[PDB]
Design an enzyme around this catalytic site. Structure first.
Site, PDB file in Angstrom:
ATOM      1  CG  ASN B 161      38.166  37.670  68.816  1.00 15.61           C
ATOM      2  OD1 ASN B 161      37.141  37.596  69.488  1.00 15.61           O
ATOM      3  ND2 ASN B 161      39.261  36.974  69.096  1.00 15.61           N
ATOM      4  CB  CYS B 182      34.437  34.140  74.144  1.00 20.82           C
ATOM      5  SG  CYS B 182      35.973  34.595  75.031  1.00 20.82           S
ATOM      6  CG  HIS B 183      36.678  28.088  77.003  1.00 25.00           C
ATOM      7  ND1 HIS B 183      35.494  27.524  77.428  1.00 25.00           N
ATOM      8  CD2 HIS B 183      37.668  27.341  77.547  1.00 25.00           C
ATOM      9  CE1 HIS B 183      35.757  26.483  78.199  1.00 25.00           C
ATOM     10  NE2 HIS B 183      37.068  26.351  78.287  1.00 25.00           N
ATOM     11  CG  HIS B 211      37.511  39.178  75.540  1.00 22.35           C
ATOM     12  ND1 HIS B 211      38.198  39.422  74.371  1.00 22.35           N
ATOM     13  CD2 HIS B 211      37.376  37.834  75.623  1.00 22.35           C
ATOM     14  CE1 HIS B 211      38.465  38.274  73.771  1.00 22.35           C
ATOM     15  NE2 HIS B 211      37.971  37.296  74.507  1.00 22.35           N
ATOM     16  CG  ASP B 268      40.604  36.306  77.436  1.00 23.57           C
ATOM     17  OD1 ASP B 268      41.836  36.114  77.485  1.00 23.57           O
ATOM     18  OD2 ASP B 268      39.786  35.429  77.082  1.00 23.57           O
TER      19      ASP B 268
HETATM   20 CO   LIG Z   1      37.742  35.360  73.469  1.00 22.43          CO
END
Ligand SMILES: [Co+2]
Ligand SMILES: [Co+2]
Lengths: 470, 470
Positions: B161, B182-183, B211, B268
């Site tokens: 990140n 990203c999950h 996110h 997120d």
């Molecule tokens: Co992430």
């Protein structure tokens, strides 16, 4: 007949400026030019009408001046409709500026310095009203819809604020032929004066949004002239002093923005900085000199009081004209009734360009349509244009605005416009809340609810409260 | 040979997840698959290598595992480069999370709750580092430039990140073949579970930025399924309780954002709300339930301590493997060394799709290129894509994201990305200052100068301080 209708002609001084310019423009000072002066406030309107008629008599102009309290009558078959109305309810107020002052006081009561309408890049006083500018937006949209039916060939010349938001909303939501007007570009001439440059020898351009314009081109004797501003900053900024509360073009704030953005903000853009220059009055005095500029708790009420006294004197002057037809307004009040001098403002040059093909360069609020390629086509920008009988022709903007202006200034201000339009059209108080949730002065959500509650509950905001009723 | 290089393989648990997935993917579990495990932290790296080798032995996989402390060796001729490195200086810290925690503490000391890196729509802990994420950005760009020379056909799979900022900067500034991973999309499955829907019967899509993704399509049995969420909100949200500090997908905050934006934020994104949900710990507990979520002054240090203890146990486990070659990691620690179960994460499915044409739907950070038409072509978005040996193929996003998501959420977050990139590439502290001038927690300019001063003066930030030296 050529019908020019002033909506809000009870704004006496501006109405007289427009009349004076029309009567001193050869192609427009004719018997077939009819100036309609319209307003809902009879005492103001009557005064403007009396003084306007006596004024054109002394200028020996043959233009016809008509007074009406009917909006439809003013719009019907008009060629140009100048919307300078700043509505207010005479049961509570004597000016649109008074309803802004009173809501601003409520904002400050709840911890919002200079009111909730003061926001980053959006400090100009009286520009928006409770964020979404309901009464002003509503009236413009009503005019636009009447004009589409009753005057389909007219231009709607929007001067009442917010010029950006209103011009955008009318264009996008009604497709009416609206153009937004503001004289902020005139700041460039003080730059040239302070740098000792003949303005006629300067190759210059500005562009941006209303009150968000930048001197993107500044050239002199075949070279970039910005090094001359750099030298002025180093040698003369330390001694700079404002001549009056409006004097900010060469201020420390303006030069700090130039250093960051790479181009000088012009005119009221200097007022529309980040919160860095506006936390409090002492901070404003650091960055704008001794007055703290015009958008503070001392100078703005002082200025609005000056306006009230000035308009009351003009209303009294109209009574004097009626009693003494022999007096010469041009002799006893030359500042208000000039002869042989145009105002320098853009409104009547625009009319003469469209109607009579007197082509001229103006700075107007019109849809981008690719002029600034990184922004949407339909977003209203304040752009350099040439105007003639074939309409409005956008100049190529060269050099382009800088990367920092785009990402740190124009895009945030454009997003605020969209927030404000969404707050209006949605009728949804949650959008007003979200705007304040992005406000640095907000400490809590409960604060937002309470400040909006009190503003909505002011007696003169009943229609606004009912508009947003969940 | 098929060379998959894990950069930052001292991140033991993630390295083991990747190895486990490769060794359980038929088309990749072959003698000609070489997994390079690279890091500059020898104790961590050695542990990951020992456990990885013992792990593949027990899975009876023939993949080759190579340990190296040389970045060039790991990049040289690689087919896929997975950047999971979170750099830190062992003279001061034992984890990249520790340098983030310590700068966050300095921010809070100066009045910035949860540190200056916590911003509206950007609350996820450890996502950016002093706004511009200098060490993390610098390393990614160094990898990208080496990869262009030493591995021109490789994919750079960015997991460290900020995924948004780094993927954008590498793409824009180097043109290297980077894709961000990203999950967060996995949140949708808890929505389906709480609404009692077979996920295989749901027609769904998400899109946005990392996110910052939204459930733009949610359909069930040939109808919009959002009315089912409306019923869950009315009947079951009052009894909702988080199972643990990470549990927020069905939280009051998520549902408040759904009510405003018209689509549910996923994963997120729920952490990345406005300041309305984050003023203080009590406010976070109102909107996220009893823990206050994971991005607060209690749960985030607690979680980072859990990580430290967990990685120390894995390092000890590696010592135990060396002493007892007969033990079975898959028997004594099945949670860490699963057999017969893929992780469900996207990294190895991506590799198998590109390399072996095992086509799959993934959610990846790639250039918009017109998928969301109101945003620039080159802005990196988190988009639904199909991946095969012919590359990445963007799905049409339908329904489009709502007007409010665009103007109130995506555009502000995209502008923040641009601010952060400008702060990095300009090396200009004034850009970091401007970012904080737009921060609601800022009370004064002097506060901004002092908090940045103290962060820059932390001993482990010497390179950062010199980078920004005016
Ligand atoms: Co992430
Ligand atoms: Co103006």
């Amino acid at each position: 007949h050529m019908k020019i209708s002033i909506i809000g002609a009870g704004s006496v001084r501006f109405a007289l400026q427009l009349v004076g310019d029309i009567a001193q423009t050869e192609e427009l000072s004719r018997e077939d030019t009819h100036i309609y002066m319209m307003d809902v406030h009879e005492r103001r309107l009557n005064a403007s009408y009396i003084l306007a008629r006596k004024y054109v008599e002394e200028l020996n102009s043959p233009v016809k001046i008509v007074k009406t309290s009917s909006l439809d009558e003013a719009i019907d078959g008009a060629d140009f409709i100048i919307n300078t109305a700043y509505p207010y309810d005479p049961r509570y107020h004597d000016s649109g500026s008074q309803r802004w002052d009173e809501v601003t006081k409520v904002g400050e009561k709840h911890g919002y310095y200079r009111g909730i309408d003061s926001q980053e890049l959006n400090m100009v006083s009286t520009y928006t009203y409770v964020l979404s500018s309901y009464p002003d937006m509503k009236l413009a949209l009503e005019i636009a819809e009447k004009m589409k039916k009753m005057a389909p060939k007219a231009y709607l010349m929007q001067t009442a604020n917010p010029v950006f938001e209103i011009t955008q909303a009318v264009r996008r939501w009604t497709g009416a032929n609206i153009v937004g007007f503001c004289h902020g570009v005139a700041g460039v001439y003080e730059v040239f004066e302070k740098l000792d440059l003949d303005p006629e020898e300067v190759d210059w351009q500005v562009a941006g949004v209303n009150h968000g314009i930048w001197l993107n081109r500044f050239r002199y004797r075949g070279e970039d002239a910005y090094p001359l501003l750099d030298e002025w900053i180093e040698k003369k900024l330390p001694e700079w002093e404002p001549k009056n509360p409006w004097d900010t073009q060469m201020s420390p704030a303006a030069m700090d923005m130039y250093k960051f953005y790479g181009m000088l903000p012009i005119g009221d853009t200097v007022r529309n900085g980040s919160w860095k220059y506006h936390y409090n009055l002492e901070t404003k005095k650091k960055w704008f000199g001794k007055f703290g500029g015009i958008d503070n708790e001392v100078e703005r009420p002082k200025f609005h009081e000056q306006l009230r006294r000035a308009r009351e004197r003009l209303i009294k002057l109209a009574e004097e004209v009626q009693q003494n037809p022999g007096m010469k307004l041009t002799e006893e009040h030359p500042e208000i009734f000039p002869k042989g001098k145009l105002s320098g403002e853009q409104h009547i040059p625009f009319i003469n360009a469209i109607a009579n093909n007197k082509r001229v360069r103006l700075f107007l609020n019109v849809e981008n349509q690719g002029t600034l390629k990184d922004f949407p086509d339909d977003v209203v920008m304040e752009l350099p244009v040439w105007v003639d009988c074939c309409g409005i022709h956008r100049e190529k903007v060269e050099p382009d605005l800088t990367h920092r202006i785009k990402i740190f200034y124009l895009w945030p201000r454009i997003l605020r416009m969209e927030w404000n339009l969404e707050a209006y059209i949605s009728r949804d108080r949650k959008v007003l809340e979200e705007i304040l949730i992005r406000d640095p002065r907000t400490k809590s959500y409960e604060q937002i609810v309470q400040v909006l509650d009190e503003i909505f509950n002011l007696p003169f905001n009943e229609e606004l409260r009912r508009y947003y009723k969940e």
